[PDB]
Design a protein around this ligand. Structure first.
Ligand SMILES: Nc1ncnc2c1ncn2[C@@H]1O[C@H](COP(=O)(O)O)[C@@H](O)[C@H]1O
Ligand SMILES: Nc1ncnc2c1ncn2[C@@H]1O[C@H](COP(=O)(O)O)[C@@H](O)[C@H]1O
Lengths: 347, 338, 347, 329
């Protein structure tokens, strides 16, 4: 059972056996990294047809809006899979969450088989509040040389993230769920977050709730990543933004391998978190793995367990073993091209 | 000169605040090494709910202190840091933590030497928060030019004094454009028109966190507001072995308080004599260098440095099996033959 | 029909024909001013028995609380009538509103027959928000020489005051209802208040909604008080506190004649707004008129129209004509004693 | 010998009421030349002008109440020039029927801070916070200005209006700093406090008890309008704004008169009288002493006075009576 909170409303397009999913190839290495996914998906017989759309921003009322073509598409099919895009007057990614009601960032960082980094056995899962907190637009110049940035924390916004965390922890069979905070000096703000978890704790008795200060969350994770391999950590916007980029640093030393999932109430977008890599674009050197894993995340969110496990457990995860495969970013010699067919083989 | 450190016929009177957790044991380690080296300092030692007053009042007399960490509640009717209270009330605005790896310690990335300077009194530690309507809470984060110019210069001054080539400002200015913006500017701004010999740069806190864990050698000195310093601090703490190896110090204009650079209480192992005093002792040496001794400091640091490099007889958390007591005595022993 | 918003839940005590009302004689001239009311009420055969209670504060948790005796009494009988009390660690009047959910101050200022002041034909009605606004406890020292006082304005708190105003304006047959504000420079704060009135405006089509800046509200009222004799003005906490004390200044030059009503959702307290006048206490010189009129405003709130109109239209209002009556404060020569019997005559 | 003053007619009766002054000025051949400006964000050009000339004479601009409205820009002008002190002069006039007569009080308000700080936000929908800033520096400043002013114009009493019993930090700081520095400096002057609501009541009922009132932005708008009414109306009130470097003179009552624009019904007493304040300022004041007596006598002398005072004359006619009385002095 997938998490009740951001539940996909299936419905395959009655005319075809398939489900509809918006793409958003994105720019840069996006196109190549993209059709790489389309092919691998084809081969495995995924009940999915691609409705690619363009999120290049309009500017209705000076405030950057996202095109109707893409809005209608994405609101319709309750799911989308975007690759990386450039930096085109109101964060593109921000107006993307605001127009689709996305409120939770899910960020896993797991060690990759056959790619040696300094940290080992790192298998981490973190849910981050992506609505409020330190990252509300609210800041003021109270006088000449004095500024206030205002951190906003509400029970409503907290409740629904903390829920998805309990429910996601359950959906992937992890016993523990840790609320990262700093009630120490942010008594009210972080205190509310923590209490809301403590109160929700009771209607999820199969999971055990722990509370940790970022202090320790960062100390302990870096000394020993595996202590959280039964994790799922929930935390407010800032701690989340840092811990997730940190976790990735532990798992892979960069974030060219990291997948993210942006869960909204009825919609949800799944993206790779690396950049547009404009300088490697077209030359067929990109590494689909990142986006590819977001595809898996998406599959599971949709309910297509069998396909997800198929494309992940076998394929990519396994084909990233043997340096004739792999890509330039992992010592490997293979091209985006050869990685994709080399993948589909064990597909 | 009612403004130098308490001193009577060659004898400094320093403030000692053991504090909670392994505090009491880890301080004692220093006492023992101190009288065994017959260092001319006398401890005025204090213990404590709001007598954080008496700590302040003491430090105001002596000007200098050596302390562990106090414990802080997470519950709603808890009292509030009072580690920060101490600093705010003395305007000891600058925290320095020293993350330098040690010879006899297994670490995942070796030969690492970086410093994290954080502002103590402001930022997200300003402790201004309220609940407008039920269930809606605002925490106000203050950033002011004066307090920021101050730390900025302290950092550069520090980097110049200890021949550090690079100073990097950690921020989130892309989102909190006024708050962290001001911080990033003021730093880079006054690293260019003063301190031109030093390399100033910025880095976004999340990305900084990632480089720190994956490729830490690229960093030299990091200047941060209260929060980001706790975070990068603990990354650095882990990188070198743990919270027990990190020397720390706090500076204001008039006072100086020396504490462990990692900031953990060790509540769980209180009274077990398992704790590691390297942190306390090393920041204790920092204090000696400060009040001018430092023949002693140069001395008793080599002692602990060699002790831990020399395999067994080292304390639990580094990979040894010795107790705080035993580790201390190896230092005093090595010391007795220098 | 009395205003839906703060509706009294009647129920006369089945054993007696009467309703139960908590008194709170208060201190100072309170006692004398009080039984003055008890007598006049007796004479007119009011369906009311007095359950006097003491609000002298306890201090549960350093925060000043109000005694159980008085709480139970007042929560029970859904109404109370307090006289003036002294200054005993958390405003006594404040913890009085917070523990009984009182949220709206109703303040009328009308010229008195046979007492000449500088302003004439002043008949004013003002409803004031008494929950939030400028008067929330929220203020901060942002650094050394810098302070923030925070004005809080919410739709929930605004809605229910603005409602009681439309509904009260209707209940006393005034066509117009004016929202005093300063949207000019407090765009969001006062803007929200104003919009909430403008939106409520529609579900009260018998009343006409106007909007005025305090600028004009104070200018116009002082140049010509009568321009608002078809008034009912609603406004946020501060503008309210000032305008009401101002209105009283116009009507009587002091506020020894001013009655207030503090409306809560299910409870409601009716008090005189003058002080304890400790120096005139016992000597029988006080002037019940103030409290007495609050009695009237209570009667109406309870539904006892006939009695209220009786005790107001005749009595006091009329007995305050002839200087042999009246009290020392109005040139008169009469005592609290003689005022009360002189009243009951035309009662 | 020729000053170049800034002229900002502004909205409403502004354009007419300014003209009245121009006419009386050239008819008295006063050695000043107007640099005159008209304007959505060219409030820039007003600032830039005043920064050159240092001195200005202006009416009021209009301010929207809607959400996408632009914002005062009367306050913008002051904040951007740090013209932090507003003085309004409420002195009753001989030929005017008022309910309480022989009244003479001054209201000094801080212009740049307080509730005019214009900091506000909406945390969640339907919940709005407006932040009111109060700072020691800006407050010590106005405090001294007020006392300095009271000393210069032989005023015996200075009273701080506040709500310090509720906003203990904000208005508290204000009340302290004022009384505090009226005791250790300016000891010759009587300092006191009064709570804004109670102040409002005394002002309407017994105004003679007040001399000078110092207030934060808001309370000054309120006591201001009480005073405006007390003496006849917004058309009789002289006003001036001061900073360290600049000075802008405007009507002391602060009303636009949008409704009667172009009707030539308006009363220029306000504008002219604060115009005389400006003359005294830039040292002329032979003229000021002069042309004030002109308008003072004109309005005391029954009919020929303008509509709102109880006459039937137009702005045009009232102006010409002044220039007439003036031509025979
Ligand atoms: N003085 C110390 N030196 C080294 N490690 C410590 C010290 N105090 C606590 N720790 C470690 O940090 C953990 C608890 O940290 P804390 O956040 O202070 O409770 C324990 O598991 C200890 O292993
Ligand atoms: N020159 C003037 N003389 C007399 N009254 C005026 C003058 N200008 C404006 N007013 C008054 O102020 C009001 C206009 O200001 P407001 O309603 O705030 O725009 C009108 O009701 C007029 O009665």
């Amino acid at each position: 059972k997938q998490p009740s909170i951001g539940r996909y409303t299936g419905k395959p397009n009655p005319s075809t056996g398939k489900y509809t999913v918006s793409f958003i190839e994105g720019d840069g290495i996006g196109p190549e990294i993209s059709k790489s996914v389309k092919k691998i998906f084809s081969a495995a017989n995924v009940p999915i047809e691609w409705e690619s759309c363009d999120v290049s921003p309009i500017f209705v009322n000076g405030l950057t809006t996202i095109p109707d073509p893409a809005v209608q598409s994405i609101t319709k099919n309750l799911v989308a899979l975007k690759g990386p895009l450039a930096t085109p007057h109101r964060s593109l990614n921000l107006t993307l969450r605001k127009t689709f009601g996305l409120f939770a960032n899910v960020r896993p960082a797991k060690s990759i088989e056959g790619f040696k980094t300094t940290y080992e056995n790192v298998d981490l899962v973190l849910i981050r509040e992506n609505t409020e907190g330190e990252y509300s637009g609210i800041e003021h110049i109270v006088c000449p040389g004095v500024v206030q940035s205002i951190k906003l924390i509400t029970r409503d916004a907290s409740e629904r993230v903390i829920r998805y965390a309990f429910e996601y922890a359950r959906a992937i069979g992890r016993p523990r769920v840790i609320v990262v905070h700093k009630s120490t000096i942010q008594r009210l703000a972080d205190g509310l977050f923590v209490n809301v978890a403590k109160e929700l704790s009771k209607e999820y008795p199969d999971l055990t709730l722990e509370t940790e200060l970022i202090d320790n969350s960062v100390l302990k994770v870096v000394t020993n990543p595996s202590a959280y391999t039964d994790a799922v950590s929930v935390c407010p916007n800032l701690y989340g933004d840092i811990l997730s980029d940190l976790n990735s640093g532990l798992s892979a030393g960069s974030l060219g391998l990291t997948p993210s999932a942006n869960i909204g109430h009825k919609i949800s977008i799944f993206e790779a978190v690396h950049g547009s890599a404009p300088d490697i674009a077209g030359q067929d050197k990109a590494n689909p793995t990142a986006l590819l894993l977001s595809s898996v995340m998406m599959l599971n969110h949709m309910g297509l367990t069998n396909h997800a496990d198929q494309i992940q457990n076998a394929v990519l995860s396994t084909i990233a073993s043997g340096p004739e495969n792999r890509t330039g970013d992992l010592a490997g010699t293979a091209t985006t091209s050869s990685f994709t067919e080399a993948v589909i083989k064990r597909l | 000169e009612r403004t130098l450190p308490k001193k009577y016929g060659g004898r400094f009177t320093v403030t000692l605040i053991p504090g909670d957790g392994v505090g009491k044991e880890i301080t004692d380690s220093v006492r023992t090494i101190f009288e065994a080296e017959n260092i001319p300092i006398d401890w005025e030692t204090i213990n404590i709910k709001e007598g954080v007053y008496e700590a302040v009042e003491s430090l105001k007399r002596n000007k200098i202190g050596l302390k562990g960490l106090w414990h802080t509640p997470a519950d709603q009717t808890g009292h509030g840091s009072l580690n920060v209270a101490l600093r705010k009330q003395l305007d000891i605005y600058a925290n320095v933590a020293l993350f330098k790896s040690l010879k006899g310690v297994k670490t995942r990335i070796p030969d690492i030497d970086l410093i994290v300077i954080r502002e103590n009194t402001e930022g997200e530690f300003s402790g201004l928060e309220h609940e407008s309507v039920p269930g809606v809470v605002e925490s106000l984060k203050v950033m002011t030019r004066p307090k920021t110019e101050r730390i900025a210069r302290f950092a550069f001054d520090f980097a110049k004094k200890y021949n550090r080539k690079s100073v990097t400002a950690v921020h989130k200015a892309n989102i909190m454009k006024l708050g962290d913006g001001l911080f990033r500017n003021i730093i880079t701004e006054i690293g260019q028109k003063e301190y031109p010999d030093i390399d100033v740069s910025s880095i976004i806190v999340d990305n900084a966190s990632m480089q720190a864990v994956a490729k830490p050698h690229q960093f030299d000195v990091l200047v941060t507001p209260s929060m980001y310093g706790t975070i990068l601090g603990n990354i650095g703490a882990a990188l070198i072995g743990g919270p027990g190896l990190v020397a720390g110090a706090n500076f204001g204009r008039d006072y100086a308080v020396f504490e462990p650079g990692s900031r953990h209480v060790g509540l769980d192992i209180k009274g077990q004599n398992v704790a590691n005093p390297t942190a306390m002792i090393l920041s204790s040496t920092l204090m000696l260098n400060h009040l001018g001794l430092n023949e002693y400091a140069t001395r008793i640091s080599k002692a602990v440095h060699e002790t831990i490099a020399e395999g067994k007889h080292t304390t639990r958390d580094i990979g040894g099996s010795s107790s705080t007591t035993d580790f201390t005595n190896e230092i005093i022993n090595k010391l007795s033959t220098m």
